[PDB]
Subunit: 411 residues, 3 copies
């Protein structure tokens, strides 16, 4: 093989290179040829990711839950925790607002096979609620059907914690192992993501290659018009959420960012919120942060509190929805906010991360990728993920420090 | 929230309070209003429990099996073990007899939606037997289908034990962990039960509230006429099984019970056979019981040997069956005995315990709760569970001591 | 029970005894009586094995994969590993050639219920490839569907290894447990096989008993005509593969076998490649083998590198195929080679081993045992497994030593 380059550029090459190879084929040799020999690889890629969606949505939440089991965290955390949720809860709320002013997709409308998309009527409100509670975890889990799963995972995780406080040692010990195994399953699923991401370059080249053969050039407008909605959203996040809640705690924002200057750029280029933990802690002290404080929060916000992603999944949803020609009904629209948070708490904080947990938010809100259109749209954002992933990852780290700094203030 | 009362009364309040709120609505505002705003909560409750039914029927038996893996128990146990089964095997056999004289349900007959219940013809005997052996554990397990599951769990558990005797240490160690993880899954599922039971008060209030709006008052007769069948069954258990097998071993029954006086009342009020282990052992010595003897049996009979429940599940089945208008065919009727034992060996020995493992015995014997009628009946017993649960739990503990005392005699 | 004999003979008795009881009923009392009271037991047996097929195809490969995770093995192994695959890869390639000259089954053609067998058209090549990648591991696994499973297992296993090299200790530790649990699941599934094999005597008696009542005596020709294809294949394996690659490394083959004389006969009679490890190592030195060399290879080739089985599963497939009247299309025919290897790397190296992993190779290549014909054919080979199993097991061990000896030469 030999293929050793820095995946980041190593992927941007497929993106920029795929777009051109796609367009030239815009005219000339009809893309049909592309939809036959090129797209197949773009699909292999798309599936390798949906593969993971279940095992991670599960293992990922049983662990996430246990890392917030009230009570199971000093009240030094209770504070920080309430922090992460509200930051992320708002992060998405903001994303929807960007989706509003910016109508990414709207106009990009596609009917794939010639037929358009239409969702199945939601069962009576009563059943929609009772359905969140799986009737058979194994089953619900066995065959897609997210929510039910999420629900069971949180209940499993939070339950495991209380076993750890069990007077009995066998019990206290069993829980430790089981919880240990789950985790690992999830932690192992990431190795797979990282691995898959090594194929990202080829896959991305196929996806965008295809989206260019078809859809003409109009997609470039929508794709970029999407990115705009994201960043103008990410920077708003920081400016309207961070600085606003930093001057609220007598913290100099300006100088603040000058210290996180290394923690941000690091995460922004590596895209590995997790792999950028050391650089996030070095900066922890540098700005006079108490040891027992960033030693606890920075490592927790590395997986949880990915408000940078929550904004992503918020806008991503409206992109798909608008591209298909469907209008999200407030209710499912507020389901995104509720979901995106758990979906973000699910993200691994690695290259693939974000995108993968998007399916979680799509299956919920009725937009199965098993559908020609949805899968056709999803394949677009998944192609420009890298771009959105960078600015994404950066906010994730920021939110952490910005939380750690504020928690110190009142501790 | 604030809600801190002693669940036991805290639930009896919903029961007694729900019945009245139900009847007043007997006349006046037709219960239809109830079947619309009240029943939904009674259902949330009913599902939270069926949820657990699979993970526990599995983890619960893999562990139960390993705790009886012949050989894997001193022959000091072999004795005690043969004891528990036969006590429980008969406990149910007795329950069926109570179901006989007392026809709980019979006359309570309901057709829910207006249609009546009718079971699917059982496949040729040949297939019924071969079917107990799952063709794909994961599958069989994934989507309901008990028996197959039970079967695989026992085989898994008993198998794990033999790995622990493996000369090789890696093998011997692996088995230890895996077995450790399973357990925990089950031990964790109980935390959930306990949790769910914290909702019991609300749920019960809904269930019985509904059963009173409909069915008029005739249900009170059947419900109580059921309780009778149980207790007059539990006391018979003790009197015809315990005292009979106590005077058979030169053990003074009268005085006997005077010592277990604290172990019984304890379990009878806490309803936590497990949580009542310390009080069961304090009494262990008090009556001159050898250390190495109650140190081994009392802790084993805390989970296994729940002959108090086996009687429950025995009568419970005939209640449902009679309420629907179906006559249990001897064969499925003897299936209950065979099932109820494993179902009791599955019970956790906690508040929820009993009822939850009932579904296990229902899915077997063809009475899926996924059915309007069955689910309608089940919802009745599940409403008066607390009452039956107390006298239940008490016999569970008794059987333990009554076994420990006899095993000492011959050891 | 009492039943304590040496399963090996203890089974040959059922085989030889079943055949006679079958034929006498050839004439006289039509076998219909047999297909009603005899076959049912032959089926119980057949299912007990298919039961295991999934849990083992999974746990079995996650472990197998981790035991070859490149890199995760000294380069002292890389050598030995490349060895096992190529030996087994060719072992099967050879089996197909035996299936060619010998047309086991061809002529044995059956239509069970009166209808013949016909496979479902394979989806477009594109989908056949993308389908190997499961969309939902849990699902794919939950309900049969091998390949997808295999694929995920290898990716899980190989992934776990890289977690063990993780700087972080928690990560490094989690992977250890999870990997530990999986293994055990598989190691436990064998206990079940061994157990099931204790029923082998009865089961085999039923199977062949039936195949004799029907099919007349013509089956004896095919059954034996099959065995021939195997052995004349196993001996060719050794002579054309081993001796050829032994004189290639200045190793005296003749004398060679005189030392493995005990390691072979041992494995040949016990049929437990694994249980014959000690006798394989005693011989390790005896022939001047470096400690650090057979201490690493012999224990690895005990589970992996079962080229004796790979030849089995190679011919076994053509037996079934020919018996049904279907011609394996080169492509699925080369799928067998690719599958048989993983299928052999799946075998446990115990009595049942081989046969059980055959289903793995059948589900792949479209020949579900859920089909009257396939299941009818499979039931024949499964009846004479013991015979093929012995000569099988022997080559498995041989390949090990023959690999160890050659790796020492160049190390
Ligand atoms: N990979 C990003 C998260 C995401 O893309 O969703 C990170 O490093 O945190
Ligand atoms: N909860 C009871 C058992 C049951 O209700 O089935 C106990 O403590 O043993
Ligand atoms: N049981 C054989 C393998 C097989 O039958 O496939 C062994 O000992 O290696
Ligand atoms: Hg996906
Ligand atoms: Hg239930
Ligand atoms: Hg099989
Ligand atoms: Na996350
Ligand atoms: Na974060
Ligand atoms: Na139990
Ligand atoms: Na008990
Ligand atoms: Na193998
Ligand atoms: Na071998």
């Amino acid at each position: 093989k030999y293929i050793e380059y820095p995946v980041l550029q190593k992927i941007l090459i497929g993106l920029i290179l795929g777009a051109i190879v796609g367009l030239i084929l815009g005219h000339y040799g009809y893309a049909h040829a592309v939809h036959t020999y090129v797209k197949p690889f773009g699909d292999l890629f798309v599936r390798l990711l949906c593969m993971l969606v279940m095992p991670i949505v599960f293992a990922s939440l049983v662990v996430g839950a246990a890392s917030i089991s009230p009570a199971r965290l000093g009240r030094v955390g209770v504070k920080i925790v309430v922090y992460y949720l509200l930051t992320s809860a708002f992060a998405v709320t903001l994303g929807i607002i960007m989706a509003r002013l910016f109508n990414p997709g709207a106009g990009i409308h596609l009917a794939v096979g010639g037929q358009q998309f239409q969702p199945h009527q939601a069962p009576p409100l009563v059943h929609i609620l009772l359905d969140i509670v799986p009737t058979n975890p194994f089953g619900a889990l066995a065959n897609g059907q997210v929510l039910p799963t999420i629900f069971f995972a949180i209940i499993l995780g939070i339950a495991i914690t209380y076993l750890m406080n069990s007077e009995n040692e066998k019990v206290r010990k069993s829980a430790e192992t089981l919880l240990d195994a789950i985790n690992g399953l999830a932690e192992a699923m990431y190795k797979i993501v990282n691995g898959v991401m090594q194929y990202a370059p080829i896959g991305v080249f196929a996806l965008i290659a295809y989206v260019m053969a078809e859809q003409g050039v109009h997609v470039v407008g929508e794709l970029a018009k999407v990115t705009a909605a994201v960043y103008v959203g990410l920077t708003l996040q920081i400016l309207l959420v961070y600085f606003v809640l930093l001057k609220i705690y007598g913290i100099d924002p300006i100088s603040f960012i000058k210290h996180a200057k290394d923690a941000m750029l690091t995460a922004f280029v590596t895209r590995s919120s997790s792999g950028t933990l050391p650089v996030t802690m070095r900066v922890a002290k540098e700005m006079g942060i108490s040891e027992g404080i960033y030693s606890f929060t920075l490592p927790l916000g590395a997986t949880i509190n990915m408000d940078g992603t929550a904004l992503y999944q918020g806008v991503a949803t409206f992109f798909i929805a608008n591209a298909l020609g469907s209008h999200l009904t407030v209710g499912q629209q507020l389901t995104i906010v509720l979901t995106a948070v758990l979906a973000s708490i699910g993200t691994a904080g690695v290259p693939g991360a974000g995108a993968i947990m998007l399916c979680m938010v799509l299956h919920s809100v009725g937009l199965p990728l098993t559908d020609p259109n949805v899968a056709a749209a999803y394949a677009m954002i998944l192609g420009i993920d890298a771009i959105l992933d960078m600015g994404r990852t950066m906010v994730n780290v920021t939110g952490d420090l910005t939380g750690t700094a504020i928690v110190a203030k009142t501790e």
